[PDB]
Ligand SMILES: *C/C=C(C)/C=C/C=C(C)/C=C/C1=C(C)CCCC1(C)C
């Protein structure tokens with residue numbers, strides 16, 4: 001199309017699609033029940049992202065929100081993606097460490113709150129209030145990060161969890177910043193650059209994260 | 225009303241309602257925990273369908289989508305039904321065979337993708353792109369069917385699973401065809417006939433499927 | 449704002465926010481896995497309510513629905529809250545009594561139906577039909593109440609469950625009445641009083657319920 005961000009949406013669609021196919025093929029033949037869980041979660045994540053990238057590319061997942069006296073292009077489909085994919089990603093971490101159910105519920109619920117309030121902020125027509133939602137969403141993210149560090153095994157489990165926790169902190173923490181400087185927030189970075197940034201983050205957080213996880217012996221039960 | 229498809233919506237509402245009441249009464253008194261799971265899942269399915277049929281009958285679950293240069297009546301409430309009822313139905317099959325959690329997640333997630341992309345296709349304003357969504361949704365359905373045949377007990381469990389798997393393949397595979405030839409897709413069959421077809425499919429896939437399942441000794445633990 | 453109900457929305461936001469913070473601090477340090485489940489569920493409930501109260505206060509969670517020949521202010525965000533918080537509350541009760549999974553699914557599903565049909569009724573443009581949805585929603589509520597009394601331990605578990613079941617029946621049963629007499633239904637009580645009533649009910653059903661639950665020894669495994 002003639003939205004300059006189309007190229008990043010197209011590459012995102014492609015990389016999510018290819019990552020989905022790769023993980024699908026890779027998990028073919030896996031019989032270990034524990035490993036199956038990780039393959040399922042980890043393949044579902046970019047498959048969902050693929051659909052939502054495509055919806056943005058085709059224009060379905062874009063709406064105009066009036067605020068600051070303009071009609072502002074907001075890609076709402078990102079939140080529909082994140083609503084499902086972010087708890088899934090947290091579930092991969094939580095299963096790695098054999099987290100308590102209470103802890104999993106805390107994580108999933110805080111994540112739901114993070115995404116839902118981010119969506120509310122994204123669609124809010126009173127400019128100043130958009131940042132209230134951003135702050136609440138960010139608080140939920142900080143709670144999530146706190147639990148990953150202070151709320152929790154085989155040495156390979158510890159090692160893989162540590163690496164993935166670090167990837168998670170670094171990549172996830174960038175999202176509120178991009179939103180804040182981008183078209184959803186202060187509008188200091190144009191939508192095409194914002195789209196590029198989220199594409200790099202998303203591909204790393206999904207396909208990159210998944211490559212790290214699915215390469216590890218941590219996803220298998222200890223078997224002779 | 226004066227929408228000619230009202231009669232099929234009314235009969236669908238009635239048959240789902242009656243099926244719900246029948247399963248409710250039938251599962252009264254069931255104490256076996258395994259059987260309770262099947263009664264719960266299986267009664268919930270037509271209860272949800274009853275609500276969404278009624279919403280279509282009353283006109284709430286209908287919207288107009290512009291495409292191909294017309295205002296096209298799209299019953300969106302079907303997807304709200306299917307979003308919940310189709311994974312529930314898959315859950316009945318998966319519990320019958322004591323499926324791995326990874327496999328259940330794969331099934332539920334692929335199903336979510338099937339329904340969500342079908343909804344996107346149903347609401348998409350660019351005619352040609354509607355069929356892209358249809359294709360992606362169909363791929364998700366084919367993945368689901370593949371898992372039911374290649375991804376998986378007491379002989380009565382095997383026997384009941386086999387029958388229900390066959391019912392599932394035959395009925396579910398008809399949905400993409402009806403959508404394709406109907407008002408959502410190529411518009412070769414009118415909405416009133418499309419509605420009739422989905423009504424027959426839905427009642428069979430829910431109340432018919434449920435009668436088969438709930439009549440079986442497979443839903444009970446092996447007890448003396 | 450100049451909506452007279454703003455004061456009740458503001459106090460609701462505050463009390464849910466404070467209740468969230470209190471439960472969060474209170475559950476700090478809890479290591480018992482069973483207790484963690486209850487703290488997680490019970491803190492998530494007012495955290496979600498806090499977000500949805502704030503959304504109503506800020507005006508995001510309000511829409512106008514034409515019916516009875518007027519444009520009627522309907523707070524839809526209540527349903528988005530209840531959709532998540534009501535099954536969570538039922539989950540607290542069900543975990544207390546170690547409910548069968550079938551029973552939990554029945555409860556959660558009936559609750560989903562209660563809330564979804566209440567939302568449909570709230571948004572329905574044909575006045576008389578709003579009450580059809582109300583009736584169906586009420587039937588789902590009555591099913592839920594029936595299960596809590598007829599569908600189900602350590603003496604402290606029994607004692608706490610009994611108290612919380614009674615609180616639940618009394619408070620939950622008031623909701624259909626308020627809706628019926630309020631702006632969503634017959635319009636005999638003005639929106640500002642309706643808002644006050646739901647605020648008192650919600651705070652009691654969430655923060656009050658939670659204080660009772662989290663003060664009990666019932667939420668802990670039996671340990672030496
Ligand atoms: C695969 C995609 C992922 C891992 C996306 C993660 C996204 C977030 C952590 C987003 C966080 C946000 C906030 C913390 C504040 C408001 C804006 C959001 C939703 C971008």
Ligand SMILES: *C/C=C(C)/C=C/C=C(C)/C=C/C1=C(C)CCCC1(C)C
Nearest residue numbers: 342358361362365396399400403429
């Ligand atoms: C009770 C209702 C059920 C079992 C409905 C099943 C529906 C489907 C399998 C629908 C599939 C579709 C596609 C595969 C492609 C696009 C259109 C859909 C959603 C009708």
Ligand SMILES: *C/C=C(C)/C=C/C=C(C)/C=C/C1=C(C)CCCC1(C)C
Nearest residue numbers: 566582585586589620623624627653
């Ligand atoms: C924390 C909030 C809670 C516990 C809310 C409970 C709400 C209900 C039990 C609402 C019930 C309703 C009906 C039974 C009929 C239609 C209207 C509703 C949704 C208010």
